[PDB]
Amino acid sequence: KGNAFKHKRALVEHIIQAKADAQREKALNEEAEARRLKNRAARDRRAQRVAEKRDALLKEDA
Amino acid sequence: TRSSVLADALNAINNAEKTGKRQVLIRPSSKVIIKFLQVMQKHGYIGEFEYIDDHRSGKIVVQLNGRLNKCGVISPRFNVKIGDIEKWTANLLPARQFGYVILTTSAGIMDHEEARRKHVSGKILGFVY
Amino acid sequence: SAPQAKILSQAPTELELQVAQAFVELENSSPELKAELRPLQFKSIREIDVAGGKKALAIFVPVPSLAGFHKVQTKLTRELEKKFQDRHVIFLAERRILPKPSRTSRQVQKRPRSRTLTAVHDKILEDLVFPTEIVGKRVRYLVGGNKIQKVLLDSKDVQQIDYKLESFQAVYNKLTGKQIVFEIPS
Amino acid sequence: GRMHSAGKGISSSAIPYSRNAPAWFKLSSESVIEQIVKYARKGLTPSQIGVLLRDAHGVTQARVITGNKIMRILKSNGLAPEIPEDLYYLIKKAVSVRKHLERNRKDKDAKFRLILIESRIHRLARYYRTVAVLPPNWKYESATASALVN
Amino acid sequence: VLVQDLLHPTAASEARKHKLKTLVQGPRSYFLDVKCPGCLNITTVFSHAQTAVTCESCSTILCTPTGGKAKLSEGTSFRRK
RNA sequence: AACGGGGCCUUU
Ligand SMILES: [Mg+2]
Ligand SMILES: [Mg+2]
Ligand SMILES: [Mg+2]
Ligand SMILES: [Mg+2]
Ligand SMILES: [Mg+2]
Ligand SMILES: [Zn+2]
Numbered sequence: 272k273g274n275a276f277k278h279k280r281a282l283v284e285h286i287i288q289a290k291a292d293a294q295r296e297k298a299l300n301e302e303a304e305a306r307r308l309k310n311r312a313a314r315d316r317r318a319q320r321v322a323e324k325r326d327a328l329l330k331e332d333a
Numbered sequence: 334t335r336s337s338v339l340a341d342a343l344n345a346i347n348n349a350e351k352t353g354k355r356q357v358l359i360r361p362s363s364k365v366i367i368k369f370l371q372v373m374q375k376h377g378y379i380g381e382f383e384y385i386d387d388h389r390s391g392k393i394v395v396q397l398n399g400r401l402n403k404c405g406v407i408s409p410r411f412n413v414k415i416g417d418i419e420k421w422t423a424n425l426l427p428a429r430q431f432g433y434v435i436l437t438t439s440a441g442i443m444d445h446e447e448a449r450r451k452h453v454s455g456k457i458l459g460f461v462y
Numbered sequence: 463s464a465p466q467a468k469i470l471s472q473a474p475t476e477l478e479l480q481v482a483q484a485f486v487e488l489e490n491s492s493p494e495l496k497a498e499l500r501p502l503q504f505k506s507i508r509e510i511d512v513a514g515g516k517k518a519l520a521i522f523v524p525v526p527s528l529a530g531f532h533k534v535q536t537k538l539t540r541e542l543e544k545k546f547q548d549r550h551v552i553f554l555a556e557r558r559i560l561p562k563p564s565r566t567s568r569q570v571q572k573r574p575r576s577r578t579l580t581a582v583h584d585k586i587l588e589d590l591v592f593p594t595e596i597v598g599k600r601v602r603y604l605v606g607g608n609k610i611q612k613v614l615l616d617s618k619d620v621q622q623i624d625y626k627l628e629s630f631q632a633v634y635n636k637l638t639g640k641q642i643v644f645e646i647p648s
Numbered sequence: 649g650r651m652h653s654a655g656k657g658i659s660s661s662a663i664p665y666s667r668n669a670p671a672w673f674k675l676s677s678e679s680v681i682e683q684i685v686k687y688a689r690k691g692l693t694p695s696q697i698g699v700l701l702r703d704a705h706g707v708t709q710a711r712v713i714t715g716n717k718i719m720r721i722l723k724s725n726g727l728a729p730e731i732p733e734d735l736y737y738l739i740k741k742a743v744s745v746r747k748h749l750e751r752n753r754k755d756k757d758a759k760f761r762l763i764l765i766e767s768r769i770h771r772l773a774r775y776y777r778t779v780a781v782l783p784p785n786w787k788y789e790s791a792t793a794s795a796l797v798n
Numbered sequence: 799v800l801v802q803d804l805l806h807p808t809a810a811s812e813a814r815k816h817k818l819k820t821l822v823q824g825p826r827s828y829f830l831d832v833k834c835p836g837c838l839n840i841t842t843v844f845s846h847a848q849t850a851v852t853c854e855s856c857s858t859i860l861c862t863p864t865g866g867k868a869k870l871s872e873g874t875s876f877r878r879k
Numbered sequence: 880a881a882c883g884g885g886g887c888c889u890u891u
Contacts, residue, residue, distance in 0.1 A: 325501070332500055355801040367603070375607060383612075383805060384601035387822050388665055394804045450883055561891040579890095588667075595669050598822060600805075639889080662823040672829075672879055703849045706829060706842025 340406040342366050342393075343459060346379070347404050350397040355380075357397060361390035368442035369459060370395065372435055373404060376444070378461050402427070406459040410437065415454045418445050425460050432462040465489075469503045478507045481519070484545050488538070502530045505556050509549075510636045518550045518629040525555040528589070535592055536622055550629040555589055557582060583638055587613060590630040594620045597647070613644050620646070652764040663709070670708060677714050680707060681721060684714075688727045694718035695733060731796070735776065735788075738769045743793050830876040834858055843868070 276282040335341060342359045349357045359366065362384060370393070373379045380396030405425075413421065413436060422445050426432035434445035438455035448454060469482055489499050505522040512518050523531055531553055542551050560577045561567055575581050588596070594616040602610045615623070623630070631642045649656035683705055687697050697718050701707040710718045722728055729736070742765040749758050769788050776782040788796075807821065817826045828845040834853050841853050843860060847868030851860045861868035870876070 328501065329497055332497065353800060356804055358804050370603070371607065374603070374605065381605045382603050384603065385821070386599040386601070388663065388667075392821070447882090452883090556890090559890055567891065582890095595666060595671075598665060637889090658818065660818070662817045662825055664825045665822055670829075700849050703844045703847050704841070704851045706844070708829075 337406065337408055338363050339366055339369065339459070340408060343369070343404040343406055346395060346397070347401075350399065350401055355397045355399075357395045359393040359395060362393050363390075365437075365442070365458075366393065369404075369435065372433070372442065372444055373401075373461050376433060376461065378404070402462050404459065404461050407457045410456040410458060413454055413457050415452070418448065418454065421445070421457065427462055433460065435459050435461060470506070472506060475506075477509065481507060481521070481542075481546070484542060487545075488541060498530070499534065502527050502534070504531075504553075510632065512550065512629050512632045514628050516548045516550055516629070518552065518632055519546065520633065521551065521553050522556045523553060525557055528553070528555060532592060539622070550626050552590060552629070552633065553592065554586065557585070583634075586637065587611075587630075587634065587642070590633060591615065591623055593622055594618075608640070610641050610643050613642060615644050615646055617647055652768065666712070668712060673706070673708075673713060675706070675713070680705075680710075680714050681725075684710070684718060684721055685725050685727065688722050688725070693733050694722055697722075732776065732781065735769060735772050736796075738765060738772060739788060739793055740797050742766055742769060743797055746790065747794070828878050830878065832860055832870075833875055835872075835874065 276285060338361060342363075345359055346357050367384070370379070370382050374381060377398075378401040380398045382393055382395040385392040385394065418434065418436070422432075422434045423429075426434060435458050436443065436445065436448055436455050437458045438448060438451075438453040440451060440453045440455075442458065443451075444461075465486065466483065467479070469485070470478055485499070489496050503524075504527075505524060507522065508520045510518050510520070535553065539551050543549075558577060559579050559582050560573050561579075563573070576585070591613075596613060597616050598614040600612050600614070602612060604610070627644045630644070634640075634642045680701070683701065684697055687700065688694075692700070695718075698707070698710055701710065707713060710716070710721065714721065716724070719728070719732075731739075742762065745758050745762050745765060749755065749762065752758070773782060773786060773788055777784055777786060804821070812820050817823060830843045830845065832841045832843050832853070833839065834856075835858075837853060837856075837858075839853060841851060841860060843851050845867050847861050848863050850863055851868075852858055853860055859871050860874065861870045863869075
C-alpha cells in the first residue's frame with residue numbers, strides 16, 4: 272500500500288528473495304553456532320586431559 | 334586536552350629555572366621526553382633526572398643547574414632536509430659558536446651537529462641553549 | 463619410576479643434581495611436605511659470583527609452578543639456605559622473550575605484553591624478592607647517562623631478604639647489564 | 649574539562665600501586681567469580697557488581713585477584729548484555745527525558761538537555777561501532793528506544 | 799621555597815594533601831572487619847560504603863551509606879586491616 | 880682522545 276511493488280511479480284520476487292535471506296542467516300547461525308559447542312566441548316575435553324592426570328599423580332605417587 | 338606532553342614538560346623546566354628554582358616536577362613522562370632530557374643533561378644545560386614509576390605514564394624530577402636559557406619545541410614536527418638544517422640552526426640559535434637544534438632522525442634523537450657528522454636527518458623536535 | 467632423575471630436565475649437571483637431591487631429603491618429612499612438594503619441579507640452575515663472601519644460586523622454573531613454588535618458597539629458603547651455606551638461593555622464571563619486530567624479524571604471530579623484554583625484566587625483580595610486595599619504584603638517570611633502578615621494598619617481614627640485596631643486585635646485573643639499588647620507608 | 653557542562657571537577661577514584669594482593673584477602677579467586685555471576689545471573693550491572701563486591705565481600709578490585717575485569721568476566725561466562733551499560737544508561741536516561749518531554753513541550757531545558765544526552769549517545773555508538781562491539785547498522789532511534797529499556 | 803626535595807618529601811605535608819596530589823596517587827580508603835551485636839561471623843566491609851551491607855543471616859544493618867565513609871550503627875567492632 | 884662507518888654476543 273506504500274506503492275512498494277510495481278506488479279504481482281515484483282512482490283513474489285521480493286518475498287522469495289526475502290525468505291532466501293533470513294534462511295541464509297538461519298544457516299549461518301546454525302553452522303557458526305555449531306563451532307561454539309565444538310569449542311565448549313573440545314576445549315573442555317582438554318580440561319579433563321590435564322586435570323585427570325594431576326588428580327592421578329597426587330594419588331599415583333602414594 | 335593535553336596534546337604535546339613534551340612541550341608541557343620543557344615549559345615547566347624553562348619556567349622554574351627562569352624563576353630561580355633548581356628542581357622541577359614533570360608529568361607525564363614520554364620516552365621522547367627522556368631522550369630529549371638526555372641530550373640536555375649530557376650537554377650540561379640541565380642536571381640529573383630521576384624517572385618516577387606510577388602505575389600511570391610516570392613522572393620525572395629534573396635538577397636545574399641554572400645556565401640554561403631556553404629549552405623548547407617545534408610543533409608541528411616538520412620534515413627537515415639536510416641542507417635545511419643549516420637554515421633552521423641559523424634561525425633560533427643564539428650564535429654559530431654554541432647552541433643546539435635537536436632533531437629526530439631515523440637513527441633517533443640527537444642534536445644538529447651530531448646529525449651533521451652522521452649525515453642523517455629526520456623530523457625536527459625542539460631546541461636547547 | 464625414578465625419583466632422582468626425573469625432577470630436572472636437560473641431562474646434567476653435578477650441581478643441578480646436588481640441589482635436586484636436597485629437595486628429596488625435604489620431600490620426606492611430615493605427610494604434607496611430600497605430595498605437595500612432589501609436583502613442584504624446576505629447570506636448570508646457574509651460579510654466579512657475589513662480591514660478598516658467598517655466591518648466588520638461581521633456580522629456574524617452568525612457571526605454571528610458581529603457583530605452588532611460592533606457596534612454599536620461604537619454607538624452603540628458611541631450609542635450603544641452611545642446607546647450602548656460602549650460597550644464596552633464588553627462585554626465577556624461565557619465561558621466553560619475543561623480540562621487537564621490524565624487517566629482519568617479520569610476518570605476524572603478534573606479541574602479547576607478557577613475553578615483552580621490558581615487561582619481563584619487571585617480573586624478574588618481582589620474583590627476586592618474592593615476599594614483600596613492592597610499594598613503589600623510580601629510576602635515576604645519571605650524569606654519565608647510565609641508570610640505577612631504585613627498587614623500593616616493603617617493610618613488614620622484609621628480614622628474609624634483609625641481607626641478600628647484593629645477590630639480587632648481582633643477579634639483575636648478570637642478566638640485564640644495568641644496575642639496581644634497594645631501599646625502604648624511613 | 650567536562651564535555652557537556654562548564655565544570656572542570658577532578659573527583660575520581662585513585663587506584664593503589666599494587667599489581668597483586670592485598671595479603672589479608674585469602675579468598676580464592678574462583679570463589680569470587682561465582683559471587684560475580686551469582687549477582688550477574690541475578691542481573692546486576694558490572695558497574696554495580698563491583699559496588700557490592702568491593703563493599704560487602706571485601707574485594708579491592710576485580711582487575712587484580714580475579715585476573716580479569718567484571719564485564720570482561722561476564723562476557724566470558726556468556727552473560728554479556730546486548731549493548732554496553734555505557735550506551736544503555738545513556739539511552740535509559742534520554743528516553744525518560746523524552747517521555748517527560750512528551751507531556752511538557754514548553755519545558756525547553758530538557759529539550760536542550762535532550763540534545764546533550766542524544767549527542768553523547770551517537771558519539772558513543774559511533775565509537776562502539778568503530779571498535780566493532782556494535783553492528784555497523786545499529787543507529788539508536790527515538791521511538792524504537794523505549795524498547796531498549798523495556 | 800626555592801630549592802627543595804620533590805623526590806623525598808615529608809609525609810607530614812604529603813598526608814594532609816590530596817589523594818591525587820601525593821607524589822604517587824594513593825587511596826585514602828581502608829577496609830574494616832566487622833561483626834554483629836550478637837554474632838561472631840566476620841564481614842569484610844569497605845571504609846566508604848555506597849551499599850548498606852548486611853552481616854548475612856538475621857538481616858542486620860551494619861552501616862548506612864553516606865556521602866563519604868559509611869556511618870556505622872550504634873555499636874559493633876572494626877579493625878582497619 | 881673528541882667523532883665518524885661497518886659486524887658479533889647478550890633468550891633476537
Ligand atoms: Mg520490489
Ligand atoms: Mg582537568
Ligand atoms: Mg565544552
Ligand atoms: Mg564540546
Ligand atoms: Mg581514572
Ligand atoms: Zn546480620
